């Protein structure tokens, strides 16, 4: 490990971690410096898997994952106190939170040119992974898992196809949380999700059926009927610009209904904590770097999307038969709704189709509870988390942890 | 008012109510004695509306409504303490909770014959209402509202048609919470609700489409295709006997997943409180009467359902143009799902169709929030409560209270 990157005293913690943690920079492609934060397994790190975590956007910080989703400690609303997370994914894994691509959070490049695309982010992320294993050569042999959320539905399978060609990397699987797998399948599934969750009436529904659909099949993705393109625009206003939280339909919109920062979300606690000078010092962040934001508007603004489907990435990964893949969706998210990703996994037409069943979690008091539904194929599973939104570990941490543990243990 | 029915000191309250409340018996048909609990408006009772409340079952106690939904005080988990309810419907109304029909809770008959049907429950409820106005003649002139939940979707429109013929009763409207309006529309809507809430996969969905449906229209109600009747049976196992809370999909099943008392619900607090001898004395319950249960299995067991649709009751009530009607559904209930009741109200084909829009509530902190969706016709509105289950006021009390206030004020 690089001893100069080790965090010794993290502001806002009342007890010192039982585990070693590092903050520094992985070399991406060209002049890119990707800020990492590595937290070793609370149990047997030497042999616990290494787990890459990517948040999406594009241009959103993986440190959101650490401080608000499944990190070893979570920022409190004061933006000062960190509290230990009993459901931390680092209970059983060495977790690498990577700010990616360049310009996101504390990540930067010397040429300070932050315009990028899916193929370049994969290649840079791949080079940062190689840099990680040069700094942490004691972790080269551990099981590697590539994981992430939302746009990491593109980041992770594109990165995975690069990693499966480097035999020095012990790739065992990938997991994508509420992931963008297929624009078409997302967009089509979202319209159904809207109607059957009571957001649209029969007036607008009956009309979409008539002008967007035929022979039992609907096109809400690239459909060109005038009335169809008109109906779908009211659907976007209702879902996206009416004051519903797109990340969790049953959650309030933070800041209330309107009469980078994601809509209906409050990033103040994390921003307050990470912009503290002493927090930056503890995290070994160069003093010259601009303020930490959750999402970089400019990376988002100048980003160029290349892939519309991950069908070929997944079938490449599945054709090797070496890797276990999990796509997991909170079933009350509307940004990357569960049905779109379930359609996606089904449309891969894989073998060993093992029947859709409920999966269970024991809650300390309430006992065994349905945590969601699972569908297992050969080397790929689709899974819902019942009552979780876009940030599954934030909404349902025990279900998120149970899912993660079972995925790692291939059981 | 009958002074001998007034409750003076209710066990488990730390402060005495600002309002008068009564517990005694309304004469139903024949030898039926229906136990009532009347709570006068906390504000200007003399002029506040009179509001009948019925819980459903059949055979479930309206005292569930008082002590766990929208009463002036709510039982705590100790089953001893009552705590004042800041969202009590009795803030602005004289609320009559009626245990109905005979044998439910503290209700009884001398002949002790508890087998009944929809037409007899209406007639008996109608006679109890007449008895109420003989005991409370000072409330004859106040605006009367008929309200209830679940099977009261049948109780209330059947009772309403009897009440609209007695000119001595000042009927202004009715409101039905998560109500059974049409078996067909419930059953058909529930199957869609199941699939689009991620409870069924494409295997079972694709099959239902093929064997239960045609020309864009599905029959999940009375359909006879062998495969259809087979698919619908897996749907009932998943929805009803897998460990999902049928009353609130996103809530845990009380008692955990299985490997009268409703499934996945814990009635202990209310039962503990109402079975206390001193509580019975305060509530003027005859010592001879058997124990209080939330739901009477036997009334349920011997009950005979007569109506399959309330279409004719509602069109009778609407044809007068004298009454305002509200059907309100928690949109995560599966026992009487919102879509079935929205289809129902739409299929009444009324006039003044006023466009489906979100409705708002101001939460003290979080500010203005979408509380659900509303569709206003002439004299009838359909309304969802976003994230509420079967017991709307239990899950979303401020949204329940706001809805109620606006319904009463005809605004
Ligand atoms: C967004 O989050 C911030 C930080 O959690 C909230 O600010 C806090 O408000 C509480 C309530 O009074 C205070 O006790 C804290 O001291 C505040 N924290 C800070 C660092 O100022 C803020 O209210 C939230 N805003 C919205 C609209 O949800
Ligand atoms: C059902 O509700 C009852 C009553 O609320 C629960 O019993 C209580 O459990 C808590 C937790 O220890 C105790 O503090 C209370 O004293 C208990 N109340 C009574 C009156 O015994 C019970 O646990 C619930 N059961 C389930 C499965 O949800």
The partner residue sitting opposite A250, judged by closest CB among B200, B375, B386, is B386
> Which ligand is nearest the CA of B81, by number?
2
Domains of chain A (ranges; CATH) run 1-411 (3.40.50.1820)
Partners of B354 in beta bridges:
B376
| List B64, B187, B333, B395, catalytic entry | B333
Q: Which long-range contacts (CB under 8 A, 24 or more apart) does A127-130 make?
A: A127/A27, A127/A28, A127/A29, A128/A26, A128/A27, A128/A28, A128/A32, A128/A34, A128/A36, A128/A98, A128/A100, A129/A26, A129/A52, A129/A159, A129/A163, A129/A169, A130/A166
Smallest Cβ distance to A369: which of B199, B257, B375?
B257
Burial status of residue B14 (CB atoms within 10 A of its CB: 0-12, 13-18, 19 or more): exposed
* Number of helices (H), then strands (E), in chain B: 13, 15
How many CB atoms lie under 10 A from the CB of residue B99? 27
Instruction: Spell out the residues 6+ positions from residue A306 whose beta carbon is closer than 8 angstroms to its own.
Output: A117, A118, A119
Task: Mark yes or no for CB contact B242/A368 under 8 Å.
Answer: no
The CA R_g of chain A, rounded to the nearest whole Å, is 21
Q: Which ligand is nearest to the CA of B79?
A: 2
> Would you tell me the crossing angle of helices A226-241 and A202-212 to the nearest 10 degrees?
140
Q: Which residue in the list B61, B88, B109, B150 is annotated as catalytic?
A: B150
Tokens 């009211």 locate to A234
Beta-carbon separation of B250 and A250 below 8 A: yes
Cβ(B137) to ligand 2 under 6 A? Answer: no
Among residues B290, B288, B315, B322, the alpha carbon closest in space to that of B410 is found at B322
- Atom index in ligand 2 nearest the CA of residue B76 equals 5
**Torsion on CA atoms A399, A403, A405, A410, rounded to nearest 10:** 160
Cα(A77) to centroid(ligand 1), Å: 6
CA of B387 to the centre of ligand 2 (A): 25
**Catalytic annotation on B150?**
yes
The Cα B122–Cα A410 span in angstroms is 59
Q: How many CB atoms are located within 10 Å of the residue B47 CB? A: 11
Report the alpha-carbon distance of residue A142 to residue B321 in Å, rounded. Answer: 75
The answer to whether the CB atoms of B196 and A197 lie below 8 A apart is: yes
Please report the DSSP string for B43-60 in residue order: S-TTTSPEEEEE--TTTB
Instruction: Identify which of A197, A225, A200, A216 has the alpha carbon closest to the alpha carbon of residue A339.
Output: A197
Q: How far apart are CA B102 and CA B115, in angstroms?
A: 9
Q: How many CB atoms within 10 Å of residue A8?
A: 7
Q: Contact A253/B200, CB-based, under 8 Å?
A: no
Q: Do B202 and A342 touch (CB under 8 A)?
A: yes
Nearest to A271 by CA among A52, A133, A78: A78
The answer to whether residues B317 and B305 touch, using CB atoms and an 8 Å cutoff, is no
CA distance A309 to A340: 12
Resolution in Å, one decimal place: 2.2
**Beta strands A73-75 and A50-54: pairing type?**
unpaired
Residue A88 is encoded by which pair of tokens? 């931390």
CB A95 within 8 Å of CB A89: yes
A332–B202 CB contact, under 8 Å = no
End-to-end CA distance of chain B: 31
Dihedral sign from CA coordinates of B282, B283, B289, B291: negative
* Sign of the alpha-carbon torsion through B191, B196, B199, B205: positive
Report the alpha-carbon distance of residue A221 to residue A114 in Å, rounded. 30
DSSP A178: S
| B360: closest chain A residue by CA | A257
The residues, ordered by sequence, that sit 6+ positions from A302 with a Cβ below 8 Å of its Cβ are A114, A115, A116
Distance between Cα B199 and ligand 2 center (Å):
30
The Cα–Cα gap between A250 and B330 comes to 12
Q: What are the backbone angles phi and psi of residue A64, rounded to the nearest 5°? A: -60, -50
3-state secondary structure A216-258: CEECCCCCCCHHHHHHHHHHHHHHHHCCCCCCCCCCCCCCCCC
| A358 contact B CB<8A | yes
CB contacts, 8 Å: B243 with chain A: 358, 360, 368-370
Site to substitute for ligand 1 among A268, A269, A271, A279, most atoms within 8 A of C-beta: A268
Record: contact B339-A363, CB cut-off 8 A: no
- B70/chain A closest Cα distance in angstroms: 21
User: Which has the closest alpha carbon to A102: A155, A154, A56, A33?
Assistant: A33
Q: What is the three-class DSSP state of B405?
A: helix
Phi/psi of residue B251, each to 5°? -100, 155
Structure tokens at A380: 């790929």
Residues 75-134 of A with CB under 8 A from B: none
A252 lines ligand 1 (CB under 6 A): no
Q: Select from B242, B342, B370 the Cβ nearest to the Cβ of A370.
A: B242
DSSP for B148-210, written as a single string:
EETTHHHHHHHHHHHHTT-TTS-EEEEEEES--SBHHHHHHHHHHHHHHTTSS-HHHHHHHHH
| Helix, strand, coil shares, percent, chain B, to 5 | 35, 20, 45
The answer to whether residue A364 neighbours chain B at the CB level (below 8 Å) is no
A217 reaches B (C-beta below 8 A): no
Interface of B with A in 41-70 (CB under 8 A): none
Q: Check if A203 contacts B (Cβ < 8 Å).
A: yes
Residues in chain B: 411
Cβ atoms of B5 and B285 closer than 8 Å: no
> How far, in Å, is the centroid of ligand 2 from the Cα of B258?
19
Please check whether residue A241 touches B, CB under 8 A.
no
Inter-chain touch A201–B249, beta carbons under 8 Å: no
| C-alpha span between B316 and B164 (Å, rounded) | 10
* Euclidean distance between CA atoms A136 and A142, whole angstroms: 11
Q: Which among A175, A118, A119, A101 has a CA at the least distance from the CA of A143?
A: A175
Put simply, whether A263 touches B (Cβ < 8 Å) is no
Method: X-ray
């Amino acid at each position: 490990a690089p001893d100069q990157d080790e965090i010794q005293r993290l502001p806002g913690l009342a007890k010192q971690p039982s585990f070693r943690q590092y903050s520094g920079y992985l070399k991406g492609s060209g002049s890119k410096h990707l800020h990492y934060w590595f937290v070793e397994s609370q149990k047997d790190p030497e042999n616990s898997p290494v787990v890459l975590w990517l948040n999406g956007g594009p241009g959103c910080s993986s440190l959101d994952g650490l401080l608000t989703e499944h990190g070893p400690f979570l920022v409190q609303p004061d933006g000062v106190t960190l509290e230990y997370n009993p459901y931390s994914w680092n209970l059983i894994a060495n977790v690498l939170y990577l700010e990616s691509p360049a310009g996101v959070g504390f990540s930067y490049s010397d040429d300070k040119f932050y315009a990028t695309n899916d193929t370049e982010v994969a290649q840079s992320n791949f080079e940062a992974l190689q840099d990680f294993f040069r700094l942490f050569p004691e972790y080269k042999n551990n099981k590697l898992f590539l994981t992430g959320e939302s746009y990491a539905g593109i980041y992770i399978p594109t990165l995975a196809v690069l990693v499966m060609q480097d035999p020095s990397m012990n790739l065992q699987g990938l997991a994508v949380g509420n992931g963008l797998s297929s624009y078409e399948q997302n967009d089509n599934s979202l319209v159904y999700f809207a109607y059957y969750h009571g957001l649209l009436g029969n007036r607008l529904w009956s009309s979409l059926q008539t002008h967007c659909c035929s022979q039992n099949k609907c096109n809400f993705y690239d459909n060109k009927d005038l009335e169809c393109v008109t109906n779908l625009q009211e659907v976007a206003r209702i879902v996206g610009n009416s004051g519903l939280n797109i990340y969790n339909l049953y959650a309030p919109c933070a800041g209330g209904v309107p009469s980078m920062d994601p809509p209906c979300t409050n990033t103040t606690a994390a921003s307050t904590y990470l912009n503290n000078p002493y927090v930056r010092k503890a995290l070994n962040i160069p003093e010259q770097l601009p303020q930490w934001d959750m999402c970089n508007f400019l990376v988002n603004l100048q980003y160029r999307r290349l892939y519309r489907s991950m069908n070929s990435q997944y079938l490449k990964l599945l054709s090797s038969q070496k890797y276990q893949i999990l796509l997991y969706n909170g079933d009350v998210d509307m940004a990357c709704n569960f049905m779109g990703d379930e359609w996606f996994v089904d449309s891969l037409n894989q073998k060993m189709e093992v029947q859709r069943r409920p999966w269970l979690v024991k809650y300390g008091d309430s006992g065994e509870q349905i945590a969601g539904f699972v569908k297992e194929f050969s080397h790929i599973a689709f899974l819902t988390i019942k009552g979780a939104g876009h940030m599954v570990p934030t909404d349902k941490p025990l279900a998120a942890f149970t899912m993660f543990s079972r995925f790692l243990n291939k059981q």
